[PDB]
Amino acid sequence: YVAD
Amino acid sequence: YVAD
Amino acid sequence: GNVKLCSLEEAQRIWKQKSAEIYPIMDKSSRTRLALIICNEEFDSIPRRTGAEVDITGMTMLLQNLGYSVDVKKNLTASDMTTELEAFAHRPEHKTSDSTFLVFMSHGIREGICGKKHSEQVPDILQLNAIFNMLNTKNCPSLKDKPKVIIIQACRGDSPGVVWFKD
Amino acid sequence: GNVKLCSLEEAQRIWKQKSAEIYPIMDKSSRTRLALIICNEEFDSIPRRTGAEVDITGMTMLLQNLGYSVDVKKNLTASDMTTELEAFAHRPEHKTSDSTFLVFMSHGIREGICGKKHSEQVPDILQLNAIFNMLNTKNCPSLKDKPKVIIIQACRGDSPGVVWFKD
Amino acid sequence: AIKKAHIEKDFIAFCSSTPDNVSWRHPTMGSVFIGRLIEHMQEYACSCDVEEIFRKVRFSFEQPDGRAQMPTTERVTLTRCFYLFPGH
Amino acid sequence: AIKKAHIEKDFIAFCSSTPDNVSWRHPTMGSVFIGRLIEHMQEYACSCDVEEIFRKVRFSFEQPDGRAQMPTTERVTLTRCFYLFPGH
DSSP: EEOO | EEEE | OOOOOHHHHHHHHHHHHHGGGGGOOOOOTTOOEEEEEEEOSSSSSOOTTTHHHHHHHHHHHHHHHHTOEEEEEEEHHHHHHHHHHHHHHOOOOOOOOOOOEEEEEBBBOEEEETTTOOOOOOEEEEEETTHHHHHTTTTTTGGGSOOOOEEEEOOOSSHHHEEEEEE | OOOOOOHHHHHHHHHHGGGGGGGGOOTTTTOOOEEEEEEEOSSSSSSTTTTHHHHHHHHHHHHHTTTTTTEEEOOOOHHHHHHHHHHHHHHHHGGGGGGEEEESSSSSSSSEETTHHHHHHHHOETTTTTTHHHTTTOOGGTTSSSSSSEEEEEESSSSSSSEEEEO | OEEEEEEEESEEEEEEOOOOOEEEEEEGGGEEEHHHHHHHHHHTTSHHHHHHHHHHHHHSSSSSBOOOOOEEOOOOOOBBOOOTTTTT | EEEEEEEOSSSEESSSSSSSSEEEGGGGGHHHHHHHHHHHHHHTTTSSSSSHHHHHHTTSSOOOBBOOOOOOEOOOOOOBBOOOOOOO
């Protein structure tokens, strides 16, 4: 998961 | 009527 | 109350219908519901909001009717307003409340609501989300998971809001 | 469609229930429904949004399913985005549409959505209400009284969104 | 133990005008929005959650009564219906 | 003749995060919000207007799934229920  |  | 009352079956239908997706209501015996009205009618430079009294009498009586004890604070300043809010964040009664209502009534401009000392040249503005920030889960853990309804009567600029169209 | 279909009685119940307070739906034979997806995955300085394709494939197919023809525009710039919007405001098909959907997917920061050339030091920001302004009744008389649904996937800053609490 | 909570959630704000625009107030009668909001709350607080009552106040503003405004609902993070439950 | 119209009305915006906060995206799967939004639209587009579908997406975010976000609905000026009417 990566933040955007 | 008055505006606010 | 002057609010149209839910007969007991009506309420029951609503909990029986949506029980998982509804805010829970605390028991009438014991909940301590708070609401807050801040209203600026006399200002230092800009003209007095004649008519505000009716609005305060209207909303005080309504919230109360809806179950709240109502603080009314009047003619404050963005800073006074902030301080009131931080105190409101800290009332013990929130712990035994299930919602709250804050109502702001003032002149406003596009940056936010005006405090009493507002002039065109020194602003006394309360920023729209100073209000949010001050009641969030960090700043107001007491109202975690409870509805916070914020109501704002204030202008949002000078434009009349209409465009012309034809036929 | 992969959307769960309303059988004809279901729809009928909904119009018969709320007819005065519902947006009217134009006839399937003839309406020309438009939607717009703008998606930035490759950026000039900041790292590529791997995964965006799935989002575009997901939303394109959905809107289409819901009845829309979908423009997809990718890797634009606040300005390119603006220009696209102004063109979108001007499509004749809106005249025979009853709603629209715009979807933006990009990095974003608290001022708004990022265009491709965004850097920390020169901003390529599309302001949250440039988008509103461009589709309002003035700038888009064609969609007067029709629902405009704007959907935005973008970050809104760096904070993780959580506060700790105990028990 | 400590758990994580969302920093904001369960908020809703209801403003008198849409951005950039005025809202209307009257001497002997107060402000159109507040009055209309009370009328609607009195009638609907029973059967409607707070978001649908707010919508119905916006719909009461749909024909420009000469003086126009259109109240706007903002920053909603209400995750569940909020039924007030008058008389309960 | 010319009549007056409201300059803005019938808008609704739906954002992935609440202000100041991140939102979550995954390589092989895309962004949590968009996926959840599709799931909910597929299931609910029939029976629910667009505002209640959006609420139900916010409720799907109420327990912090480790990665937390809480989508926010903004600038609503929808004056009436918007039922999509799939298959119509």
